[PDB]
């Protein structure tokens, strides 16, 4: 499992907050407790690998293994941590999902996001087409017969290097887990 870092430089921002007591004395505005809580927003990139090779062994029934990896992928996209969500509801779904089945070695696309992205515009489309570009040069420099598929919540661009654009996350997961053996 890899750490999830932003695709563009984001600085923390101080959220000045205060607690207000409901029992007022004859000197009002004596709020409960002044304080400052730091928050930050941004478009995170995430990555993870599942080695069924040295996996299925420890288990057996390729069908049970198949169920475990399929529910794993669905949980990887579905879940979102539970940190301060009750105060900042940040439940979301990935704007781009790329599952690839490689028969030689796992590979991450983190260096694609090495040069930070400057903004004032959105970051999802730029990140999508830039991940595509990196997949293209890396694919044409380390040629390999692997399987690639991806879903996206934006029909503007066409991502060639990412494989065959499936229609939805669960369809992508089903066709990829099936294509995995």
């Amino acid at each position: 499992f890899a750490h999830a870092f932003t695709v563009h430089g984001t600085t923390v921002e101080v959220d000045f907050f205060t607690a207000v007591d409901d029992i007022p004395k004859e000197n009002d505005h004596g709020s409960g407790h002044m304080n400052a809580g730091q928050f930050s927003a941004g478009t995170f990139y995430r990555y993870a690998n599942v080695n069924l090779d040295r996996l299925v062994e420890n288990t057996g029934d390729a069908q049970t293994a198949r169920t475990a990896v399929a529910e794993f992928l669905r949980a990887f996209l579905s879940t979102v941590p539970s940190g301060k969500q009750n105060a900042t509801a940040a439940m979301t779904l990935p704007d781009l999902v790329h599952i690839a089945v490689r028969f030689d070695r796992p590979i991450s696309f983190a260096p694609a996001f090495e040069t930070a992205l400057y903004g004032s515009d959105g970051y999802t489309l730029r990140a999508c087409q830039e991940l595509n570009n990196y997949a293209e040069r890396l694919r044409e420099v380390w040629p390999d017969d692997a399987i690639r598929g991806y879903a996206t919540v934006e029909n503007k661009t066409d991502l060639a290097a990412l494989g065959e654009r499936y229609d939805s996350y669960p369809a992508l997961i089903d066709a990829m887990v099936a294509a995995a053996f």
Binding site: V12, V14, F16, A36, Q38
Partner: protein, 511 residues
């Protein structure tokens, strides 16, 4: 019967001054006798090394140093004498066997009667066994959680090699937690509590040279003239758990080897090369501070008159061998007495001094029972290489002047930054910033040091000038400014943080 004597059994990793290939295990007598042939000896645990080097120095001082001053201008004459033993070059084998002849029966770890620095009476009189886990360091004890240092579930106790047993044993007998150990029933009296280790949470400074021999005799602190005493394994009669521990002005009472605050025991296996169970508990219950303060440590005075050792700091080990460089300086009250009586010229060494190197064994810990980290620190021989390679007197002196300068000022701003963060956080609320500030400060400021030693263009200041050129001061401004940057937004924190931030600007000698 199972038996294991440190005399001939190999438990010390030793390597010669030769090729430096395939080092191997040696016993105590064997590494001592042929020390002249061996470069150095070591054991993986720096605590165990900090006590091992103390018993080695005490032995070499039992025979070589003679550990007894004469009486005609004693100190001086003593320095002369040891300078003569150094001039000879090595150890006398009949002296080694002459010293074990008096104690050939003492060094067995598993001796059925009066073992080596253990309490035989503690075999019985203890209801439960402390377990090997508590004896081994970095191993999960009964209350600890089984996550780190390899799982050890209080059960299936992986038996330890007798070597590892004397390492962890010698270390625990030194550094030791304080509180709630195995209970003992002394004279019908039971008292479940224990005191802390004598060296707990302190960095030790041991000088080391080319050959192990000169290192041993250089690690000999001037035996305070007084009632000649003996180490722990020489005492003819076993100590009394109650009562005040014997007092000792001699070196055996200043190297902390006369009486220990703990009492461990090893339960031998039938094979004789493995430990299966152990006992760790209080050996002395009445407090006693050791007179004639430890020459290895660095001591600093607080208010009210108490003198205490400067505690260790993992933050200083963020860069390798940081304290090792104390051979430069020196430094303002920050210097062990052993160095102050063996490294300078007021002694009589002639050419081994021109190759002397410092080493430091540090194990930061809380003073009660919680441990954080260990680390060793051997000075970089490259700093000697630079001074020798040029063969120019004025440049040989300008280089060392540049290292001395950069080191002194480096630590100066380190402590100035510590008080800066302590006052900044302690005044902001009317701390947690010291850890981050210091860690990032040394981690970041050491590549600058190596940048200044090779007179390469460093941040802030370009090569060519006299000293450090006031550069890591700017590094301290960087670390301090970023560790507290996101929190100095509102004017309160801003003005306090700034008011304490206007100190780093000194010394700050301009161009």
């Amino acid at each position: 019967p199972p038996s294991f004597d440190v005399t001939i059994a190999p438990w010390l990793i030793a390597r010669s001054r030769d090729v430096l290939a395939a080092p191997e295990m040696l016993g105590l007598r064997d590494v001592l006798i042929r020390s002249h042939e061996l470069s150095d000896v070591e054991i993986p645990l720096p605590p165990g090394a900090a006590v091992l080097w103390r018993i080695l120095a005490l032995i070499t001082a039992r025979i070589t140093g003679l550990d007894q001053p004469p009486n005609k201008n004693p100190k001086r004459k003593w320095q002369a004498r040891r300078s003569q033993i150094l001039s000879k070059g090595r150890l006398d084998p009949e002296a080694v066997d002459a010293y074990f002849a008096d104690y050939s029966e003492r060094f067995d770890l598993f001796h059925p009667e009066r073992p080596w620095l253990q309490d035989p009476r503690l075999r019985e009189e203890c209801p439960k066994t402390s377990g090997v886990n508590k004896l081994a360091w970095g191993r999960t004890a009964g209350e600890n959680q089984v996550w780190l240092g390899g799982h050890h579930h209080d059960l299936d106790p992986h038996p330890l090699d007798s070597a590892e047993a004397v390492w962890h044993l010698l270390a625990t007998l030194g550094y030791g937690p304080s509180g709630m150990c195995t209970a003992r029933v002394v004279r019908g009296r039971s008292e479940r509590n224990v005191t802390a280790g004598p060296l707990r949470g302190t960095v030790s400074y041991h000088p080391l040279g080319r050959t192990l021999f000169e290192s041993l005799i250089l690690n000999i602190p001037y035996p305070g003239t007084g009632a000649a005493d003996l180490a722990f394994w020489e005492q003819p009669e076993l100590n009394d758990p109650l009562g005040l521990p014997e007092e000792s002005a001699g070196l055996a009472g200043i190297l902390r080897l006369d009486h220990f605050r703990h009492a461990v025991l090893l339960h031998p296996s039938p094979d004789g090369s493995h430990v299966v169970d152990a006992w760790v508990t209080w050996a002395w219950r009445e407090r006693n501070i050791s007179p004639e303060l430890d020459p290895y440590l660095i001591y600093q005075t607080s208010k009210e008159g108490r003198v205490y050792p400067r505690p260790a700091e993992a933050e200083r080990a963020i860069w390798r061998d940081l304290d090792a460089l104390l051979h430069y300086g020196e430094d303002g009250n920050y210097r062990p007495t052993i160095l102050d009586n063996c490294t300078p010229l007021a002694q009589v060494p002639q050419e081994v001094l021109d190759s002397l190197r410092l080493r430091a064994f540090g194990f930061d810990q809380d003073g009660q029972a919680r441990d954080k980290q260990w680390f060793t620190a051997t000075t970089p021989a490259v700093l000697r290489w630079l001074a020798d390679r040029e063969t120019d007197d004025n440049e040989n002196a300008r280089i060392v002047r540049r290292i001395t300068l950069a080191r002194k000022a480096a630590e100066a701003l380190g402590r100035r930054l510590e008080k800066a963060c302590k006052e900044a956080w302690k005044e902001s609320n009317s701390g947690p910033w010291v850890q981050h500030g210091m860690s990032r400060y040394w981690a970041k400021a050491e590549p600058v040091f190596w940048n200044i030693v090779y007179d390469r263009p460093a941040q802030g200041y370009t090569p060519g000038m006299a000293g450090p050129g006031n550069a890591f001061n700017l590094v301290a401004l960087a670390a301090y400014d970023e560790v507290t940057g996101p929190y100095c937004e509102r004017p309160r924190v801003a003005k306090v943080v700034e008011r304490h931030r206007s100190t780093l600007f000194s010394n700050w000698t301009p161009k």
